[PDB]
Amino acid sequence: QGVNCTEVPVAIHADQLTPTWRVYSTGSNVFQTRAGCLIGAEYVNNSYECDIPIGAGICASYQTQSIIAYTMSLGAENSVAYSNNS
Amino acid sequence: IAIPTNFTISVTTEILPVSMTKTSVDCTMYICGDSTECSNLLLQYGSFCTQLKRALTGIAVEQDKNTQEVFAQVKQIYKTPPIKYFGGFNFSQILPDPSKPSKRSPIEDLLFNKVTAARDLICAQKFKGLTVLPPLLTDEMIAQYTSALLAGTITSGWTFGAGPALQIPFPMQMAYRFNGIGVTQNVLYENQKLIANQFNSAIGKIQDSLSSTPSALGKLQDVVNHNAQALNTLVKQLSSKFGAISSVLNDIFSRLDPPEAEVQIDRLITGRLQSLQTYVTQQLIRAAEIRASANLAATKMSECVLGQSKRVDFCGKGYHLMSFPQSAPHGVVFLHVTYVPAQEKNFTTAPAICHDGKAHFPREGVFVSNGTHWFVTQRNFYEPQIITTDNTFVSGNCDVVIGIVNNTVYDPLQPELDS
Amino acid sequence: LPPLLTDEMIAQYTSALLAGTITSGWTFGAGPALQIPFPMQMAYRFNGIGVTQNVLYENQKLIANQFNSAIGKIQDSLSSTPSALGKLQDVVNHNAQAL
Amino acid sequence: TQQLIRAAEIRASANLAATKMSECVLGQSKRVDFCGKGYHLMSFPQSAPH
Amino acid sequence: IAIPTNFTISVTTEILPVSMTKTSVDCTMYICGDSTECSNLLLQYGSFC
Numbered sequence A: 001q002g003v004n005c006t007e008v009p010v011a012i013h014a015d016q017l018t019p020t021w022r023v024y025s026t027g028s029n030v031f032q033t034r035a036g037c038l039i040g041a042e043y044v045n046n047s048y049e050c051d052i053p054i055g056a057g058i059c060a061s062y063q064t065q066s067i068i069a070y071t072m073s074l075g076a077e078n079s080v081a082y083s084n085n086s
Numbered sequence B: 001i002a003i004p005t006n007f008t009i010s011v012t013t014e015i016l017p018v019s020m021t022k023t024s025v026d027c028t029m030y031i032c033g034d035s036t037e038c039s040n041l042l043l044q045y046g047s048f049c050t051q052l053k054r055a056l057t058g059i060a061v062e063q064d065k066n067t068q069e070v071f072a073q074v075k076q077i078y079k080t081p082p083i084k085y086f087g088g089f090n091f092s093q094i095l096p097d098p099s100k101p102s103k104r105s106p107i108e109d110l111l112f113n114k115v116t117a118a119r120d121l122i123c124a125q126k127f128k129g130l131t132v133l134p135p136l137l138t139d140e141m142i143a144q145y146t147s148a149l150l151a152g153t154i155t156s157g158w159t160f161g162a163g164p165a166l167q168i169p170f171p172m173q174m175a176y177r178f179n180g181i182g183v184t185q186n187v188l189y190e191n192q193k194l195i196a197n198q199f200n201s202a203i204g205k206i207q208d209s210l211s212s213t214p215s216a217l218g219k220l221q222d223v224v225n226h227n228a229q230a231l232n233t234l235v236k237q238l239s240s241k242f243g244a245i246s247s248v249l250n251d252i253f254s255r256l257d258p259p260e261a262e263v264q265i266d267r268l269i270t271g272r273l274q275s276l277q278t279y280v281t282q283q284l285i286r287a288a289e290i291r292a293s294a295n296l297a298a299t300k301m302s303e304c305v306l307g308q309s310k311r312v313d314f315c316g317k318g319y320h321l322m323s324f325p326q327s328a329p330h331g332v333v334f335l336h337v338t339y340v341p342a343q344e345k346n347f348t349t350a351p352a353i354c355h356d357g358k359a360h361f362p363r364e365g366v367f368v369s370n371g372t373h374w375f376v377t378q379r380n381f382y383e384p385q386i387i388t389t390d391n392t393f394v395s396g397n398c399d400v401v402i403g404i405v406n407n408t409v410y411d412p413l414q415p416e417l418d419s
Numbered sequence C: 001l002p003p004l005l006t007d008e009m010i011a012q013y014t015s016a017l018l019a020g021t022i023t024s025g026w027t028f029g030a031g032p033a034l035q036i037p038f039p040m041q042m043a044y045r046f047n048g049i050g051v052t053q054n055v056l057y058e059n060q061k062l063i064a065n066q067f068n069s070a071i072g073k074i075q076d077s078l079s080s081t082p083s084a085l086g087k088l089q090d091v092v093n094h095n096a097q098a099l
Numbered sequence D: 001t002q003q004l005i006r007a008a009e010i011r012a013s014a015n016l017a018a019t020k021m022s023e024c025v026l027g028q029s030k031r032v033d034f035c036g037k038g039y040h041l042m043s044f045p046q047s048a049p050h
Numbered sequence E: 001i002a003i004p005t006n007f008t009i010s011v012t013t014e015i016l017p018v019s020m021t022k023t024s025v026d027c028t029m030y031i032c033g034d035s036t037e038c039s040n041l042l043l044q045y046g047s048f049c
Ligand SMILES: *[C@@H]1O[C@H](CO)[C@@H](O[C@@H]2O[C@H](CO)[C@@H](O)[C@H](O)[C@H]2NC(C)=O)[C@H](O)[C@H]1NC(C)=O
Pocket: A083, A084, A085, B083, B085
């Protein structure tokens, strides 16, 4: 949360407070959101209803099977055939 | 009796806060700072800050719930027709503007503008373990929801709030709403231009009033202010000694022996923990207040925007006609359109009419006299008519009603039969 | 600290509300106050609940009598019982206990 | 803290009182059991200590 | 079906609290009273008041 993740711990033997469960950065779909940096989720261009809220309009889900991140959809488009004699 | 002879279309505003700022606290960094040896003593106090994290997470989830329950009341995203003719009503001041990149209305932009190299305050607070979490819904999404609600209420009336959206011309919808407050349809159909002009002028006056005055949104601004101050105080509490020799623990540790350093660090830790607990309690109380306000806003969205309300003074001052929503930073603004009587006149009135030994009462209106002659009119608008058997009903004789008067009730059948 | 509004001002506000509702019905709550005879507005209110107007006009005196009696009974409920105003007393007692 | 909680409760009660003043005194209400038991006709306000 | 043939006019009462007592507290008078050195020591405790 709130990390540019260009400063994410590359790590050698011990330079991170988390108890040394380093997750691979380059090869595990690092993504940058306004809520921070997400590791282990693939960003897709589709849009579904929110499943797990990440933040700033970004949600995550388990689909395909892997974890994906996307922008939530507010609903299905609809247009009313307005006229002034109908 | 006094009967109005004219009317006015009024537009008023109501501002309601919806959501609060979501904050997060790093307990170890706030209390012991960067010194890795102070944190060892913190473990001897139990699970003191897991409760803090739990409460703050609950508040953060509740804020998103508030926003969702206020603004996400539409199943589909309705789109306004490309042609913006609605019988003379303009609506251009509340519809989204496509030229601007924000896709916001001329009034939403003003609202967002109104509500608000040395280290910034945000960075200074962040360097001590206090952070702000972004909301789930962005401003663009809330603007989209508001636009969908506006398009639905302009194209379908109140039908889209109870099922499938059914199209209806705007003049006919306004006639329905006039019928809803006890005024006949021909009153609107014979004054369409005047009513449209009055509505447009009122919308322009809302424009000018919101643009000129700068203290109208103090309800929302307070919500912002009460947050910032609450954080600032916390930071200031880091500069108090709480009875110790100094407020810097590195100096204490590099200065003297553990036997007294224990007491110094203990009193510092107790003071910091007390400050954090007080902050959390105040946050919980303020969250309850915000939740009540958001519930009221959701009820008003359901009952004033998605329908026509008969409750007095719930959706403005006067007889409610309709309502339009707009989004504002951390809140919502309702524009209420209401009907106000004007230009009343004096008349003499009677409760019943005596004719042929029978008492007649008006079916819908009231009996009035201009000085020599008697008519029957609707209650909210002066429109005299000849008293016939088609707008009256008979009950009993004239010996029971107090105040009955003598007049003639015209039978439409006799002239047609004799001709 | 003393409240901003005194009891006389609140009594004035209540008297204004009562006078408006007695002389004008519900019109003063939505715009200009329009006068109407009290019997006619009572007939309007009877129409509001689904009863025809004549039912009032043919039973006026009796209805009035009933109303009067009811008001009198209310007074007895405030001159025989000592637990009707318990909520305000509870507020006062809670403040005093905290202090 | 206790004073703040009590103030919140009092504010809720005052909001209800304002709504009842608006809807039962300034108009005729169709809501069931909001302005008494039975079919509401009218309402009259009186002031009391607090 | 059952249909009424008469009616009754009923008057009932409802009591609602509106306001609360407004109180103010003097810190140093409650905590320290008339002792100056207690006030000097309390001036170091922050901005609780
Ligand atoms: C009924 O609807 C039609 C269809 O929109 C209206 O025709 C429009 O009239 C305006 C008048 O300035 C034109 O600018 C539009 O270009 C017309 N529409 C199209 C598709 O060309 C018609 O005016 C409406 N009826 C009334 C009485 O206004």
